[PDB]
Amino acid sequence: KVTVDTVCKRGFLIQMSGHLECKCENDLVLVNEETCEEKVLKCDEKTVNKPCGDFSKCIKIDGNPVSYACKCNLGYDMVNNVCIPN
């Protein structure tokens, strides 16, 4: 859905591979197609729902000892710890 009129939040449009993409400034990560935010390095209670990578967020998993994990967004597989479209 990235077009010539997409406004990349803390990023910029660039042609990568075939078409337009938002590329993040500095070391920010993609939280969606057009939004770049800060990448936390720990998934715990202090970072729940924060970006932990391109299209990945810290989630709280309900079991016994409650756990946290960096999970990809719907439509992506954590492949060698990198979210990539399914």
Epitope: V7, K9, R10, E25, N26, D27, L28, E38, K39, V40, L41, K42, K46, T47, K50
Partner: antibody
Framework: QVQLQQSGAELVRPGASVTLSCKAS????????MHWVKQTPVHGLEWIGA????????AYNQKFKGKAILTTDKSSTTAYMELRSLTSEDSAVYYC?????????WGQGTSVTVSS | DVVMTQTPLSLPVSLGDQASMSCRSS???????????LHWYLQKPGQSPKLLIY???KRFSGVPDRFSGSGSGTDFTLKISRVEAEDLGVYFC?????????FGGGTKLEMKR
């Protein structure tokens, strides 16, 4: 490109106030906080405070509470710092800066000279 | 407040030398999000400080690759692999982990003779 254009040099009588401006252009104004920083030879670089332009909410270094007042105006994409009741200790260069985890761009600075 | 201390105050060098500067913090700069928000700036006379390295070792866009930062917790180090004339100026470190954000006093990189 990203530009922070600060207002010109100020000459201020002791006890008066003055308002400095920082016009932001080349980026989405509400996506970054604005920081203000004071520089003097004696005290070096000092963080004055930060303002979130989406909400106008400021946060202040305790040292500058009551001395500085940060506002933002969305329509003009400008941050303001008002300095109140100026003394000779307020003579300095004042910078605004665009912040998101790091201040990547700074204004050119505003000279403030306090003298009667 | 976190106090940031830089050594040396003056770094005399000849062009082509390597340069190394220290920045120490009174408190760990590790953020609860895992990151370390320690940055380095260069300020030339009459100009604003310009970002060189952010988050300990990441080079800002457009910065020559002769600049590198390293360190962890409280001790940080900026290195210039080969000093050029455009590098003379005052190098400031600063932390944005803890409010209020604070800067070191600066290391001035100057010409030796």
């Amino acid at each position: 490109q990203v530009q922070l254009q600060q207002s010109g040099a100020e000459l201020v009588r002791p006890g008066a106030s003055v308002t400095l401006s920082c016009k932001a252009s080349g980026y989405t104004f509400t996506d970054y906080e604005m920081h203000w920083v004071k520089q003097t030879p004696v005290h070096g670089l000092e963080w004055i405070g930060a303002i979130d332009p989406e909400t106008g909410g400021p946060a202040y270094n305790q040292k500058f509470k009551g001395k500085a007042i940060l506002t933002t105006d969305k329509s003009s994409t400008t941050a303001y710092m008002e300095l109140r009741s100026l003394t000779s200790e307020d003579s300095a260069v004042y910078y605004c800066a665009r912040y998101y985890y790091v201040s990547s761009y700074w204004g050119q600075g505003t000279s403030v000279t306090v003298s009667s | 407040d976190v106090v940031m201390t830089q050594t040396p105050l003056s770094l005399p060098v000849s062009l082509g030398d390597q340069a190394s500067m220290s920045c120490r913090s009174s408190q760990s700069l590790v953020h609860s999000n895992g990151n370390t928000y320690l940055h380095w700036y260069l300020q030339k006379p009459g100009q604003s400080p310009k970002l060189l390295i952010y988050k300990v070792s990441k080079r800002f866009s457009g910065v020559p690759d002769r600049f590198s930062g390293s360190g962890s917790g409280t001790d940080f180090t900026l290195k210039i692999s080969r000093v050029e004339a455009e590098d003379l100026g005052v190098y400031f470190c600063s932390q944005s982990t803890h409010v209020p954000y604070t800067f070191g006093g600066g290391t001035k990189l100057e010409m030796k003779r």
